[PDB]
Amino acid sequence: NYVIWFENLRMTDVERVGGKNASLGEMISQLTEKGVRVPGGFATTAEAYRAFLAHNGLSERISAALAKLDVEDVAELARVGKEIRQWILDTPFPEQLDAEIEAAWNKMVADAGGADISVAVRSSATAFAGQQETFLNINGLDNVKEAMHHVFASLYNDRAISYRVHKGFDIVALSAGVQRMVRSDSGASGVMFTLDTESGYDQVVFVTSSYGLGENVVQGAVNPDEFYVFKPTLKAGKPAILRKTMGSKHIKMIFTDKAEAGKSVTNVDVPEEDRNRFSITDEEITELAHYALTIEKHYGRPMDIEWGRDGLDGKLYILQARPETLCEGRAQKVGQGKVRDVLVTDMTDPDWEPVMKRASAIVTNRGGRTCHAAIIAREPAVVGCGNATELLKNGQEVTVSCADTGFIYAGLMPKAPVKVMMNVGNPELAFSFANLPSEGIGLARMEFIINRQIGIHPKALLEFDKQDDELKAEITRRIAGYASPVDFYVDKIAEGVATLAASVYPRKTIVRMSDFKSNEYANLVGGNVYEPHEENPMLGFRGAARYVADNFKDCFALECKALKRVRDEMGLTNVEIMIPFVRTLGEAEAVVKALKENGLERGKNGLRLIMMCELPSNAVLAEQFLQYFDGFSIGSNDMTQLTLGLDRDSGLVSESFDERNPAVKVMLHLAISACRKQNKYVGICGQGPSDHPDFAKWLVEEGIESVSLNPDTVIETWLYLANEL
């Protein structure tokens, strides 16, 4: 009645032991047979806490103090809070609670065969983050009891007294969970989410990991390794890790031999070995992602989960699991209104709850997550702007974004006649566009992955051994966590492309192979020596000619190895491969021969092959080029430049650039007709349809199958076109 074992708790015991302990029992009792390993222990109950607090009778003394106390007088609140906490600290456990803890402790050491076990003593409130309060590596009975005293006192931490007065409430209790320690002090640990927190995208599992006890990743005291795993392909048993980001992993929490009270754990530097390694293996990331899903399937909602790899066992444990739910400040949701209605002020009392109702947004100088105004806006909301009173003006006219640095500008689906698809380059933004209404990605560009995730010329990696001490050293630095220089290149392209394809899966993602000019390959590390200066880069060594050049075929092979893995192993079959700058029919033919050499063929595993139609020759021999491909994506930028003989970046001529020049239109017509008479895909890329609505009109009238737009131009164009139909 005072102490309950986790194995006898269920999620229906939340009022008795709190959400954390109830959830622990729910997993132990229901999921251990589904493979989830949760450490054992016991919870104290809400009536244990009440009995404890009745003493002489402390409960009513606390209640008296809290009565006459302004929580928004920050002195009194610190003074009264400290006072209350010392009373709880100086109050002894009732005789029955001590005996019952002792008997439960004695059974734990009996279950552990021997033994000098250690435990976590955590706070499980009948109600965050947490400020919570937790104790780790607590080795004997009296330590455990004193760590429990502290947990009990934590209910009346100052912010907790506020948080409750703010949520508008007495007069409360909590439960202490006493759980066996997993030895991740010599292993690794972290936190998993069964959605992407940033975007909200729920088809992915997020796994963060570092060395040591997981308290550090939970608290953000360390920058951890971050991994994304794709749910559908993980369930089919295919390799499902989309993205690996190495954390700096500066420090790690370990055990002390020297445990006075909270000195049982300490932070220590991570060696440079471990720092530039990934802290868990692919097999582990995957194994954890499976646990995440069986937990989420069971609870029927998004989950936030703590886990640890025991450095003794080797085995992965789930430790805790719970449900997951100009000017600047702390930030989901956008909003609009006049700045006064967007309310701009220092910080709200509760007296600011009527006039708060008389308004439509809140932006405040002070505050963090559990700020007064930040809670009213959850039940929105930019807090923690040092000076918005200053920056923002009393007039108007603003709109307040949270799609988590909470900006504040400075501003303010029907049937479509074509398919509106996205033009996407940055895989770090991919899950934020999963959400946007589109028909997929009609141009997934490769150049951000190469510039920004890889950063090194593939021939420098291919010929690593011919460098350059200074360069061998730079490459090795950059390729940390990957098996070899060439494996880095393939792996990172696979990650980037799998990520983009996963974002809109199962929807079409047309991946353009690399469209770099040689001056862009020259800027990569190790690149200049392979990329001589050209007089006219727009017209130089790039595209198909580069892919099939003897001098560069081993690099093309690398990019092909990545795409093939993405489709053939990762099961991301929604990927089509687009080939740019195909100048002649001999090049078209050479490229399909090259792809074939590298295991990629039309019809094999459903592969579809698209040509970027961007040279005038592609238009006047449309039908002839089209035999080699399943369709065209028209690159109107390059088509316009070559038809009209212009560099649109040169200001001296570029006023004559116009995708809707009659000469360019003849070219588009030739291409789009050729495709139509073969019942073949024809799309167009470029912002022309967005920037010139009549061009969009002309394109629908020509029979274009799709249009590919920057995500932030997608809704407007869709609506314009739908309204026209």
XYZ file of C-alpha atoms in Angstrom:
725
model
C 0.000 0.000 0.000
C 3.078 2.225 0.618
C 5.601 0.414 -1.563
C 4.619 -1.273 -4.846
C 6.802 -3.328 -7.176
C 6.968 -2.202 -10.822
C 5.938 -5.672 -12.048
C 2.616 -5.060 -10.169
C 2.003 -1.592 -11.688
C 0.111 -0.776 -14.859
C -0.700 2.477 -16.601
C -3.976 2.613 -14.690
C -1.913 3.238 -11.479
C -0.942 6.809 -12.491
C -2.700 8.503 -9.547
C -0.930 6.231 -7.123
C 2.661 6.162 -8.478
C 2.711 8.887 -11.185
C 3.115 8.528 -14.968
C 6.796 7.509 -14.955
C 6.448 4.574 -12.533
C 3.102 3.452 -14.004
C 4.664 3.365 -17.452
C 7.622 1.343 -16.112
C 5.171 -1.269 -14.748
C 3.143 -1.219 -17.959
C 6.304 -2.106 -19.952
C 7.611 -4.686 -17.468
C 4.267 -6.418 -17.174
C 3.286 -6.311 -20.889
C 6.378 -5.958 -23.145
C 9.194 -8.018 -21.653
C 7.762 -10.946 -23.644
C 7.901 -8.666 -26.749
C 11.728 -8.271 -26.059
C 11.844 -4.997 -24.095
C 14.257 -5.117 -21.162
C 13.411 -2.784 -18.313
C 15.255 -2.717 -15.015
C 13.274 -3.739 -11.938
C 12.490 -1.861 -8.730
C 9.709 -0.278 -6.670
C 7.601 2.842 -6.289
C 6.319 4.613 -3.233
C 2.663 5.622 -3.454
C 0.753 8.881 -3.086
C -0.622 7.731 0.297
C 2.947 6.924 1.461
C 3.716 10.595 0.706
C 0.589 11.819 2.534
C 1.380 9.725 5.592
C 4.954 11.028 5.617
C 3.780 14.627 5.237
C 1.092 14.379 7.975
C 3.885 14.352 10.590
C 3.181 16.812 13.458
C 1.374 17.988 11.048
C 3.860 19.368 8.540
C 1.264 19.137 5.746
C -0.836 21.946 7.214
C 2.206 24.067 8.059
C 3.239 23.913 4.370
C -0.367 24.651 3.344
C -0.394 27.661 5.732
C 2.815 29.173 4.272
C 1.746 28.607 0.648
C -1.603 30.239 1.489
C -0.117 33.642 2.339
C 2.607 33.806 -0.350
C 2.837 35.665 -3.665
C 4.559 33.193 -6.030
C 5.332 36.150 -8.299
C 7.315 37.756 -5.567
C 10.496 35.986 -6.296
C 12.155 36.575 -2.978
C 9.385 35.335 -0.785
C 9.110 32.350 -3.017
C 12.736 31.376 -2.767
C 12.556 31.950 1.014
C 9.348 29.966 1.635
C 10.371 27.204 -0.829
C 13.712 26.621 0.922
C 11.964 26.613 4.260
C 9.435 23.982 3.160
C 12.150 21.846 1.623
C 14.142 21.853 4.887
C 11.069 20.689 6.796
C 10.606 17.737 4.460
C 14.359 17.008 4.797
C 14.124 17.172 8.569
C 10.953 15.021 8.722
C 11.505 11.341 9.442
C 9.870 8.523 7.495
C 6.994 6.882 9.272
C 7.937 3.576 10.827
C 5.842 1.612 8.378
C 7.291 3.370 5.334
C 10.895 2.687 6.520
C 10.147 -0.983 7.189
C 8.428 -1.386 3.803
C 11.265 0.310 1.904
C 13.736 -1.862 3.741
C 11.831 -5.031 2.859
C 11.657 -3.982 -0.816
C 15.343 -3.091 -0.844
C 16.145 -6.452 0.678
C 14.270 -8.232 -2.094
C 16.132 -6.321 -4.847
C 19.538 -7.384 -3.374
C 18.123 -10.919 -3.117
C 17.018 -10.828 -6.816
C 20.494 -9.670 -7.729
C 21.886 -12.960 -6.347
C 24.453 -11.238 -4.135
C 24.930 -8.315 -4.097
C 26.178 -4.709 -3.788
C 23.690 -3.404 -6.420
C 23.185 0.324 -7.162
C 19.923 2.079 -7.976
C 18.394 5.223 -9.405
C 15.976 7.141 -7.171
C 13.731 9.158 -9.457
C 10.759 11.470 -9.050
C 7.391 10.328 -10.553
C 4.828 13.092 -10.003
C 1.007 12.697 -10.183
C 0.881 15.390 -12.883
C 7.743 17.851 -17.649
C 11.410 17.746 -18.825
C 12.545 17.276 -16.196
C 13.707 19.557 -13.492
C 12.064 16.544 -11.821
C 14.824 15.274 -9.549
C 16.895 12.122 -9.870
C 19.792 10.317 -8.170
C 22.062 7.715 -9.707
C 24.363 4.964 -8.466
C 22.958 4.920 -4.909
C 24.520 1.859 -3.314
C 22.909 1.156 0.109
C 19.670 1.369 2.196
C 20.362 4.589 4.111
C 21.673 6.318 1.002
C 18.528 5.279 -0.820
C 16.313 6.627 1.992
C 18.140 9.961 2.082
C 18.002 10.250 -1.725
C 14.250 9.607 -1.347
C 14.004 12.466 1.157
C 15.461 14.774 -1.430
C 13.133 13.538 -4.161
C 10.165 14.153 -1.787
C 11.418 17.676 -1.043
C 11.756 18.361 -4.801
C 7.929 18.583 -5.099
C 8.351 22.008 -3.491
C 11.232 23.207 -5.661
C 10.487 26.863 -6.305
C 9.639 26.532 -9.978
C 7.326 23.619 -9.143
C 5.463 25.832 -6.629
C 5.115 28.431 -9.387
C 4.310 25.893 -12.142
C 1.390 24.691 -10.048
C 0.186 28.165 -8.976
C 0.370 29.084 -12.677
C -1.551 25.996 -13.953
C -3.951 27.353 -11.282
C -4.384 24.971 -8.337
C -2.524 22.890 -3.356
C -1.546 20.505 -1.929
C 0.073 17.660 -3.826
C 2.123 14.468 -3.678
C 4.721 12.458 -5.505
C 6.156 8.927 -5.867
C 9.821 7.846 -5.672
C 10.811 5.168 -8.176
C 13.796 3.099 -7.088
C 15.223 1.319 -10.107
C 18.236 -0.854 -10.681
C 21.157 0.764 -12.469
C 22.284 -0.285 -15.867
C 26.010 -0.069 -16.442
C 26.025 2.479 -19.292
C 28.742 4.281 -17.336
C 31.101 1.986 -19.296
C 28.683 1.741 -22.243
C 26.419 4.240 -24.026
C 22.949 5.701 -23.575
C 20.451 8.280 -24.814
C 16.885 9.141 -25.756
C 14.647 7.978 -28.628
C 11.562 9.601 -30.093
C 9.011 7.833 -32.289
C 8.591 10.958 -34.393
C 10.793 13.725 -35.641
C 10.454 16.295 -32.869
C 11.485 19.204 -35.131
C 8.939 18.656 -37.903
C 6.429 16.329 -36.296
C 6.922 13.758 -39.030
C 5.848 10.420 -37.571
C 7.280 7.939 -40.114
C 10.698 8.131 -38.554
C 12.356 7.157 -35.239
C 14.967 9.577 -33.804
C 17.838 8.114 -31.758
C 20.363 10.142 -29.842
C 23.319 8.461 -28.170
C 26.456 9.196 -26.241
C 28.819 7.566 -23.775
C 28.080 7.362 -20.070
C 24.871 7.607 -18.110
C 22.005 9.022 -20.146
C 21.274 11.859 -17.745
C 23.575 14.037 -19.846
C 21.772 13.562 -23.147
C 18.395 13.977 -21.390
C 19.606 17.288 -19.917
C 21.451 18.490 -23.036
C 24.795 18.603 -21.186
C 26.377 16.779 -24.139
C 25.984 17.023 -27.951
C 25.158 13.372 -28.845
C 25.233 11.206 -31.957
C 21.905 11.575 -33.845
C 20.291 8.921 -36.059
C 17.064 8.675 -38.073
C 15.470 5.313 -38.811
C 12.614 4.798 -41.295
C 9.617 2.978 -39.873
C 8.133 1.289 -42.962
C 11.372 -0.269 -44.207
C 12.443 -1.125 -40.622
C 9.200 -3.142 -40.320
C 9.945 -4.920 -43.610
C 13.406 -5.832 -42.202
C 15.438 -3.752 -44.680
C 18.300 -1.458 -43.714
C 16.498 1.626 -42.437
C 19.057 4.061 -41.057
C 18.630 7.220 -43.132
C 20.991 9.603 -41.512
C 23.874 9.572 -39.105
C 25.195 12.785 -37.484
C 28.253 12.490 -35.290
C 28.082 14.291 -31.959
C 30.998 16.109 -30.403
C 30.480 14.009 -27.222
C 32.810 16.083 -24.998
C 32.027 14.591 -21.648
C 30.449 11.488 -20.074
C 28.861 10.688 -16.677
C 30.522 7.791 -14.844
C 30.440 6.261 -11.366
C 32.523 7.452 -8.438
C 33.948 5.036 -5.797
C 33.309 8.063 -3.633
C 29.540 8.443 -3.146
C 28.652 10.832 -0.285
C 25.069 11.660 -1.561
C 24.858 13.195 -5.100
C 28.620 12.749 -5.519
C 27.964 9.094 -6.600
C 28.283 10.203 -10.246
C 30.581 12.683 -11.968
C 31.401 14.082 -15.430
C 34.658 13.216 -17.071
C 36.150 14.023 -20.473
C 35.641 11.571 -23.334
C 38.911 10.440 -25.002
C 39.549 11.435 -28.594
C 39.207 7.902 -29.821
C 35.588 7.697 -28.703
C 34.779 11.309 -29.563
C 35.202 10.903 -33.320
C 33.541 7.504 -33.285
C 29.821 6.806 -33.305
C 28.881 5.622 -29.804
C 26.536 2.843 -30.960
C 26.606 0.525 -34.011
C 24.123 0.219 -36.852
C 22.927 -3.108 -35.415
C 22.228 -1.263 -32.102
C 20.478 1.786 -33.671
C 18.266 -0.728 -35.455
C 17.615 -2.892 -32.408
C 16.590 0.166 -30.427
C 14.310 1.415 -33.195
C 12.465 -1.934 -32.982
C 11.979 -1.483 -29.233
C 10.678 2.035 -29.877
C 8.007 0.720 -32.215
C 6.839 -2.093 -30.018
C 6.520 0.497 -27.182
C 4.606 2.954 -29.465
C 2.374 0.213 -30.862
C 1.517 -0.738 -27.295
C 0.699 2.756 -25.977
C -0.893 3.864 -29.260
C 0.921 7.175 -29.333
C 4.164 8.988 -29.886
C 6.700 8.150 -27.221
C 9.785 9.731 -25.648
C 12.071 6.897 -24.401
C 15.302 6.630 -22.333
C 17.630 3.673 -23.035
C 21.039 2.370 -22.052
C 23.630 -0.080 -23.275
C 25.127 -1.959 -20.351
C 28.936 -1.871 -20.730
C 29.076 -5.126 -18.653
C 26.159 -7.143 -20.310
C 26.377 -5.582 -23.794
C 22.587 -5.573 -23.603
C 20.207 -2.705 -24.400
C 17.671 -1.650 -21.766
C 14.764 0.766 -21.835
C 14.968 2.833 -18.687
C 11.931 5.171 -18.940
C 9.194 5.819 -21.532
C 6.483 8.478 -21.752
C 4.123 10.118 -24.255
C 5.683 12.836 -26.422
C 2.712 15.168 -25.766
C 12.016 41.196 -37.173
C 12.446 40.046 -33.558
C 13.198 36.705 -31.879
C 12.625 34.547 -28.839
C 11.786 31.024 -27.749
C 9.229 29.222 -29.916
C 4.394 24.731 -33.183
C 2.100 27.191 -34.907
C 2.183 30.468 -36.838
C -0.067 33.469 -35.902
C -0.908 37.013 -37.045
C -2.277 40.314 -35.727
C -1.701 43.894 -34.647
C 1.047 44.388 -31.989
C -0.626 45.738 -28.814
C -3.949 41.167 -31.463
C -0.362 39.976 -30.748
C 0.324 40.945 -27.093
C 3.792 42.394 -26.426
C 4.844 42.782 -22.790
C 7.428 41.977 -20.028
C 5.782 38.997 -18.297
C 2.243 38.028 -17.331
C 0.847 37.618 -13.811
C -2.344 35.549 -13.489
C -4.095 39.003 -13.486
C -3.126 38.997 -17.167
C -5.695 36.222 -17.884
C -8.700 38.430 -18.737
C -6.931 40.832 -21.144
C -5.022 37.718 -22.429
C -8.442 36.382 -23.553
C -8.988 39.739 -25.350
C -6.148 38.870 -27.847
C -4.627 36.446 -30.410
C -0.861 36.006 -29.625
C 1.749 36.475 -26.880
C 5.342 37.654 -27.142
C 7.280 38.346 -23.883
C 10.659 39.750 -22.756
C 11.222 37.178 -19.990
C 10.601 33.438 -19.628
C 11.476 29.901 -20.715
C 9.465 26.711 -21.462
C 7.510 26.626 -18.148
C 7.054 30.416 -18.122
C 3.527 31.665 -17.112
C 2.592 32.918 -20.578
C 4.159 29.839 -22.252
C 1.612 27.584 -20.474
C -1.487 29.659 -21.358
C -0.321 29.433 -24.968
C 0.064 25.657 -24.895
C -3.436 25.250 -23.463
C 1.042 30.830 -29.218
C 3.953 31.889 -28.086
C 7.331 33.506 -28.237
C 9.008 34.052 -24.832
C 12.562 34.965 -23.884
C 13.070 37.989 -26.147
C 15.288 40.256 -24.017
C 13.896 43.406 -25.614
C 10.694 43.188 -27.655
C 9.134 46.062 -25.792
C 12.019 47.795 -27.563
C 12.386 46.012 -30.918
C 8.614 45.748 -31.523
C 6.510 48.897 -32.032
C 3.036 49.708 -30.686
C 1.494 50.114 -34.169
C 1.187 46.689 -35.774
C 1.699 44.604 -38.028
C 3.289 41.266 -37.399
C 3.058 37.476 -37.629
C 4.649 35.031 -35.232
C 6.223 31.776 -36.584
C 7.127 28.462 -34.830
C 7.799 26.199 -37.859
C 12.067 26.341 -32.275
C 13.755 29.827 -32.403
C 10.277 31.433 -32.603
C 10.626 34.363 -35.023
C 8.353 37.399 -35.397
C 8.184 39.208 -38.758
C 7.618 41.938 -40.257
C 4.798 40.502 -42.461
C 1.341 38.821 -42.911
C -6.927 20.994 -51.045
C -8.811 21.541 -54.340
C -8.274 19.530 -57.537
C -5.186 20.728 -59.493
C -4.960 20.405 -63.290
C -1.264 19.325 -63.081
C 0.632 17.541 -60.290
C 2.343 20.069 -58.012
C 5.637 18.500 -56.868
C 8.541 19.996 -54.868
C 12.033 21.076 -55.768
C 14.216 20.029 -52.785
C 17.999 20.198 -52.157
C 18.518 20.099 -48.399
C 17.939 16.753 -46.658
C 18.174 18.451 -43.290
C 14.803 20.141 -44.180
C 13.140 17.067 -45.745
C 10.854 16.084 -42.867
C 9.521 19.646 -42.596
C 8.195 19.227 -46.170
C 6.786 15.699 -45.712
C 3.890 17.659 -44.321
C 3.310 20.105 -47.263
C 0.664 19.020 -49.754
C 2.499 17.779 -52.853
C 2.732 14.836 -55.232
C 6.366 14.119 -54.266
C 9.765 15.562 -55.171
C 10.063 16.241 -58.897
C 13.685 17.413 -58.496
C 15.802 16.128 -55.579
C 19.124 17.878 -56.163
C 22.453 16.259 -55.141
C 24.680 19.303 -54.700
C 23.963 20.220 -51.092
C 24.803 16.612 -50.119
C 28.115 16.866 -51.976
C 29.066 20.434 -50.971
C 27.812 20.344 -47.452
C 27.699 16.747 -46.163
C 30.727 15.361 -48.027
C 32.800 18.414 -48.917
C 35.642 16.515 -50.701
C 36.359 15.741 -54.365
C 35.630 12.041 -54.992
C 38.968 11.610 -56.875
C 40.825 12.833 -53.763
C 39.040 10.019 -51.853
C 39.567 7.512 -54.671
C 43.292 8.423 -54.761
C 43.665 9.015 -51.006
C 47.031 7.281 -50.987
C 48.546 9.687 -53.555
C 47.993 12.723 -51.392
C 49.372 14.856 -49.439
C 49.995 14.323 -45.759
C 48.194 17.521 -45.025
C 45.321 16.312 -47.094
C 45.247 12.747 -45.958
C 44.871 14.190 -42.503
C 41.960 16.510 -43.501
C 40.043 13.735 -45.243
C 40.433 11.306 -42.341
C 39.142 13.964 -39.980
C 36.078 14.507 -42.155
C 35.363 10.798 -42.792
C 35.333 9.973 -39.074
C 32.803 7.238 -38.365
C 33.054 5.754 -41.906
C 35.069 2.717 -43.040
C 37.088 4.355 -45.805
C 37.365 7.479 -47.934
C 35.185 5.973 -50.736
C 32.692 4.450 -48.291
C 32.234 7.932 -46.808
C 31.226 9.250 -50.239
C 28.787 6.432 -51.096
C 27.330 6.313 -47.538
C 26.676 10.046 -47.348
C 24.955 10.158 -50.773
C 22.818 7.141 -49.688
C 21.939 8.936 -46.473
C 21.081 12.175 -48.229
C 18.999 10.534 -50.950
C 17.295 7.977 -48.643
C 16.349 10.898 -46.373
C 14.793 12.922 -49.218
C 12.960 9.779 -50.560
C 11.845 8.766 -47.074
C 10.354 12.241 -46.549
C 7.642 11.853 -49.186
C 7.572 8.057 -49.369
C 5.945 6.341 -50.868
C 5.714 9.253 -53.297
C 7.859 9.817 -56.360
C 11.276 11.291 -55.681
C 13.175 12.076 -58.891
C 16.874 12.235 -57.969
C 19.112 14.309 -60.275
C 22.669 12.956 -60.433
C 25.321 15.578 -59.862
C 25.062 18.640 -61.991
C 28.278 20.329 -60.874
C 30.342 22.486 -63.191
C 34.086 21.858 -62.870
C 34.566 25.136 -60.953
C 32.259 23.691 -58.277
C 34.215 20.419 -58.068
C 37.356 22.576 -57.835
C 36.075 24.213 -54.568
C 35.740 20.841 -52.771
C 38.718 19.794 -50.643
C 41.363 18.224 -52.889
C 39.543 19.415 -56.016
C 41.606 22.001 -57.933
C 44.237 19.547 -59.093
C 41.482 17.539 -60.904
C 39.523 20.448 -62.319
C 41.373 22.798 -64.663
C 39.942 26.275 -65.196
C 37.488 26.600 -68.096
C 36.664 29.787 -70.049
C 32.954 28.949 -70.186
C 32.007 26.518 -67.335
C 28.286 26.482 -68.353
C 29.365 24.798 -71.600
C 32.187 22.639 -70.184
C 32.918 19.299 -68.522
C 29.714 18.350 -66.757
C 26.727 16.058 -66.924
C 26.660 12.943 -69.080
C 30.061 13.763 -70.655
C 31.610 13.804 -67.227
C 29.783 10.599 -66.178
C 31.066 8.578 -69.099
C 34.544 10.137 -69.383
C 37.228 7.491 -68.718
C 38.926 10.058 -66.575
C 35.850 10.167 -64.146
C 34.001 6.857 -64.422
C 35.078 5.531 -61.014
C 33.421 8.605 -59.436
C 30.171 8.069 -61.314
C 30.350 4.450 -60.153
C 30.361 5.780 -56.594
C 27.197 7.819 -56.988
C 25.536 4.839 -58.740
C 26.464 2.518 -55.880
C 24.628 4.910 -53.521
C 21.418 5.177 -55.617
C 21.326 1.424 -56.171
C 21.595 0.759 -52.459
C 18.802 3.223 -51.729
C 16.412 1.383 -54.132
C 17.614 -2.202 -54.074
C 18.469 -2.623 -50.374
C 16.798 0.181 -48.491
C 13.638 -0.460 -50.477
C 13.162 3.194 -51.331
C 11.785 2.283 -54.721
C 9.983 5.636 -55.146
C 13.327 7.041 -56.319
C 13.710 7.707 -60.064
C 17.106 8.729 -61.470
C 17.347 11.866 -63.587
C 20.359 12.510 -65.843
C 21.328 16.093 -66.693
C 23.217 17.695 -69.581
C 22.829 14.922 -72.186
C 24.155 16.737 -75.247
C 23.958 14.059 -77.934
C 22.295 10.681 -78.595
C 25.751 9.095 -78.237
C 25.960 10.461 -74.707
C 22.407 9.199 -73.885
C 23.483 5.786 -75.094
C 26.803 5.864 -73.229
C 25.102 6.851 -69.974
C 22.573 4.029 -70.077
C 25.531 1.714 -70.804
C 27.399 3.157 -67.798
C 24.427 2.828 -65.506
C 23.990 -0.724 -66.652
C 27.650 -1.480 -65.890
C 26.905 -0.170 -62.357
C 23.797 -2.349 -61.887
C 21.139 0.241 -62.751
C 18.748 -0.512 -65.676
C 15.343 0.560 -66.811
C 12.928 -2.146 -65.852
C 15.244 -3.821 -63.352
C 13.633 -3.499 -59.881
C 11.171 -1.103 -61.497
C 13.774 1.549 -62.136
C 12.626 4.648 -64.014
C 15.137 6.883 -65.794
C 14.330 10.565 -66.539
C 16.347 12.945 -68.694
C 16.637 16.537 -67.797
C 15.596 18.206 -71.020
C 17.738 21.338 -70.958
C 19.703 21.702 -74.215
C 18.152 22.865 -77.525
C 19.174 19.510 -79.030
C 16.993 17.734 -76.434
C 14.014 19.685 -77.865
C 14.652 19.318 -81.623
C 15.521 15.566 -81.203
C 12.950 15.102 -78.428
C 11.558 11.848 -79.893
C 14.962 10.369 -80.519
C 16.310 11.184 -76.997
C 13.100 9.945 -75.472
C 13.734 6.309 -76.583
C 16.474 6.086 -73.974
C 14.295 7.384 -71.091
C 10.907 7.122 -69.355
C 10.261 10.842 -69.646
C 11.652 14.370 -69.359
C 12.000 16.984 -66.669
C 12.447 20.272 -68.458
C 15.202 22.505 -67.074
C 13.892 25.855 -68.298
C 16.834 27.817 -66.844
C 19.387 26.072 -69.000
C 17.032 25.775 -71.947
C 16.473 29.552 -71.820
C 20.191 30.328 -71.520
C 21.241 28.136 -74.436
C 18.318 29.033 -76.755
C 18.964 32.699 -76.196
C 22.759 32.536 -75.725
C 22.860 34.171 -72.241
C 24.361 33.811 -68.838
C 21.477 34.925 -66.597
C 24.046 35.698 -63.852
C 25.636 38.327 -66.075
C 23.905 41.566 -65.383
C 25.039 43.033 -68.661
C 22.667 40.911 -70.735
C 20.366 39.091 -68.393
C 17.334 41.349 -68.813
C 16.592 39.360 -71.911
C 16.326 36.174 -69.998
C 12.750 35.000 -70.166
C 11.513 31.388 -69.962
C 8.484 32.622 -71.898
C 10.340 34.006 -74.852
C 8.611 32.564 -77.911
C 11.863 30.760 -78.834
C 11.917 29.007 -75.484
C 8.227 28.154 -75.833
C 8.830 26.462 -79.215
C 11.432 24.326 -77.410
C 9.114 23.435 -74.519
C 6.396 22.556 -76.937
C 8.639 20.258 -78.913
C 9.659 18.454 -75.696
C 6.229 18.240 -74.130
C 4.546 16.948 -77.384
C 7.232 14.314 -77.895
C 6.492 13.042 -74.389
C 2.748 13.121 -74.773
C 2.683 11.039 -77.930
C 4.654 8.308 -76.097
C 2.493 8.493 -72.977
C 5.682 9.434 -71.146
C 6.339 11.611 -68.067
C 6.879 15.306 -68.747
C 7.647 17.691 -65.883
C 9.098 21.172 -65.655
C 11.496 22.712 -63.092
C 12.085 26.327 -62.230
C 10.075 29.027 -60.581
C 8.648 30.319 -63.868
C 5.181 28.798 -63.272
C 5.127 30.492 -59.839
C 6.656 33.824 -60.884
C 4.513 34.103 -64.091
C 1.012 32.720 -63.672
C 0.274 32.939 -67.399
C 3.301 30.698 -68.062
C 1.702 28.089 -65.712
C -1.464 28.566 -67.722
C 0.414 27.999 -71.000
C 2.044 24.888 -69.560
C -1.258 23.292 -68.460
C -2.647 24.133 -71.896
C 0.388 22.323 -73.437
C -0.284 19.190 -71.322
C 2.567 19.293 -68.795
C 2.207 16.385 -66.319
C 3.812 18.141 -63.375
C 5.512 21.215 -62.075
C 8.346 21.290 -59.477
C 8.456 24.270 -57.152
C 10.365 25.499 -54.116
C 8.310 24.361 -51.078
C 7.422 27.963 -50.115
C 5.809 28.612 -53.542
C 3.793 25.376 -53.560
C 0.431 26.335 -51.940
C 0.069 29.605 -53.870
C 0.668 28.012 -57.270
C -1.519 24.984 -56.494
C -4.378 27.340 -55.485
C -3.923 29.625 -58.509
C -4.003 26.631 -60.825
C -6.939 24.914 -59.034
C -8.962 28.118 -59.115
C -8.284 28.406 -62.868
C -9.673 24.856 -63.556
